[PDB]
Design a binder for these strands. Structure first.
Length: 266
DNA sequence: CGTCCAGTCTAC
DNA sequence: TAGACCTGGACGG
């Protein structure tokens, strides 16, 4: 996922788990190379928050829960095929790699981290990844200042389309978003990042890094039924669209654009 | 059947 | 900077 998908997953976990109580341990698939989650409680509530491309679950035991346990935090990155689903306990999806089980009374459900390709990860810490910059969705002002204050950094030597994926500065921006952001301003994708950003300090490029992803969030849906995908496909103006050019950036990722490739094109 | 296509993370 | 990590769907022979 990118920022909007991670944000919508966090809203999903919060709304779906709102009136649920989990009990038991946290079960991992045998094939997952991520860590076993050392957690058990007779009664715990799960809630979520998103920051850029990361999602933090908090497991919160109720008063009196046994074994005595402090709340535990987990941070997930989704990679290419991560998601959360709420399913019936005995109809787990095929790649449900981490599950939380509701306690009785009611229908035994499973909250599942589902990741087909297993590019996603989780850590026990609870900390956000050091080096990821502020969330373009929820920390706009911190995100904007973190870029403008560091334009000397070598990251800004690269083409703008490459700098937009560097999660140190654009935490939450991925491939469709970089295309859609640059198309709104008709910025050539191989314009130099420092050139485009130096021309700041008018919705501008950094503002669009917040407002474009926010548009996706306001669509709703995107896994969180299938008509939700036509909603998103209709919103797109550039990424994958007939009549648009594509190039490979230097890390082999496809950038979609209109017109001028830009000076630093391969 | 085969190939090609869809974000880190780590070794050189 | 180049390959490593994975599965599945579209599509071509």
């Amino acid at each position: 996922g990118q920022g909007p998908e991670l944000h919508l997953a966090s809203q999903f976990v919060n709304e779906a788990c709102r009136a649920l109580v989990f009990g038991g341990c946290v079960e991992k698939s045998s094939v997952s190379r991520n860590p076993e989650v050392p957690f058990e409680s007779s009664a715990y509530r799960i809630s979520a928050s998103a920051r850029g491309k990361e999602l933090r679950l908090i497991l919160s035991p109720l008063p009196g829960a046994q074994p005595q346990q402090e709340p535990l935090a987990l941070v997930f990155r989704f990679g290419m095929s991560g998601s959360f689903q709420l399913v019936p306990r005995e109809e787990l999806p095929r790649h449900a790699h981490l599950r939380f089980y509701t306690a009785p009374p009611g229908p035994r459900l499973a909250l599942c981290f589902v990741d087909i390709r297993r590019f996603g990860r989780w850590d026990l810490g609870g900390k956000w990844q050091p080096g990821r910059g502020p969330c373009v969705l929820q920390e706009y002002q911190q995100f904007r200042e973190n870029v403008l204050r560091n334009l000397a950094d070598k990251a800004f030597d690269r083409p703008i389309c490459e700098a937009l994926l560097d999660q140190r500065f654009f935490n939450g921006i991925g491939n469709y978003l970089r295309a859609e952001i640059l198309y709104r301003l008709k910025i050539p994708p191989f314009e130099k990042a420092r050139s485009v950003l130096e021309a700041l300090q008018n919705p501008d490029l950094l503002e669009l890094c917040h407002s474009v992803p926010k548009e996706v969030v306001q669509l709703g849906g995107k896994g969180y039924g299938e008509e939700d995908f036509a909603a998103f496909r209709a919103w797109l103006r550039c990424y994958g669209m007939p009549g648009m050019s594509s190039l490979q950036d230097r890390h082999g990722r496809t950038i979609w654009f209109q017109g001028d490739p830009g000076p630093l094109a391969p």
